[PDB]
């Protein structure tokens, strides 16, 4: 907590997970879901690592840390995807070797509506001209916020404190960029309201994924399965 605004951005920037790859090899529902879930499983291991480096996170109890991650995992995957997809209109950059447009969403039942939503969010980013600094703040807000709702009180407080620090950081970035106070509070809100849509998309993908498991369309890793099972 005792870090500057600039150190907060530094810390979060330095902790970013790597952009992973898929396979290099006319999708079935099975092939695409196999690729998409294999990638998500591999991204999750890194995500666990990254969360430990989000300032204030490891000061929580393991139980709480687990809870927040179970709650947020898909949201975090999604905003990450949306951020990679920003410079690629009409497309989703799951990996540098897996760039999918909306039609390819039709290869799996129920997927293209989730694609459209994700594409709508990347547009919003592009219209807003979201910055990397802004992004890693939002990703970290998602982690701390999504699952937070007597010593239990003391823990909640801590999270709200960290959250307050990231809000200051976001405002500091806008202030440095030269935005007026009015524009600063407007942008903060625009940024934060997008989090509602990401929650929505996440709830939908969660349900979509549970259906796919039920169909036995695709093998899921023990980890990916337990995160699914957490909801």
């Amino acid at each position: 907590l005792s870090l500057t605004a600039d150190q907060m951005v530094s810390a979060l920037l330095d902790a970013e997970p790597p952009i992973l790859y898929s396979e290099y090899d006319p999708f079935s529902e099975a092939s695409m879901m196999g690729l998409l879930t294999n990638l998500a499983d591999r991204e999750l291991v890194h995500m666990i690592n990254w969360a430990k480096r989000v300032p204030g996170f490891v000061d929580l109890t393991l139980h709480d840390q687990v809870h927040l991650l179970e709650c947020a995992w898909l949201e975090i995957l999604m905003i990450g995807l949306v951020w990679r997809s920003m410079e690629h209109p009409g497309k989703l950059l799951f990996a540098p070797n897996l760039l999918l447009d909306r039609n390819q969403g039709k290869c799996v039942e129920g997927m293209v509506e989730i694609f459209d939503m994700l594409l709508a969010t990347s547009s919003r980013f592009r219209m807003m001209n979201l910055q990397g600094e802004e992004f890693v703040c939002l990703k970290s807000i998602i982690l701390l916020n999504s699952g937070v709702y007597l010593k239990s009180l003391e823990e909640k407080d801590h999270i709200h404190r960290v959250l307050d620090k990231i809000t200051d950081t976001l405002i500091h970035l806008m202030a440095k960029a030269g935005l007026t106070l009015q524009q600063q509070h407007q942008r903060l809100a625009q940024l934060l309201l997008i989090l509602s849509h990401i929650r929505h998309m996440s709830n939908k993908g969660m349900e979509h994924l549970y259906s796919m498991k039920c169909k036995n369309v695709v093998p899921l890793s023990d980890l990916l399965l337990e995160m699914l099972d957490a909801h």
Partner: peptide
């Protein structure tokens, strides 16, 4: 516990 609990702990 869970797999996630150990990954976070370790």
């Amino acid at each position: 516990h869970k797999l996630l609990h150990k990954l976070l702990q370790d």
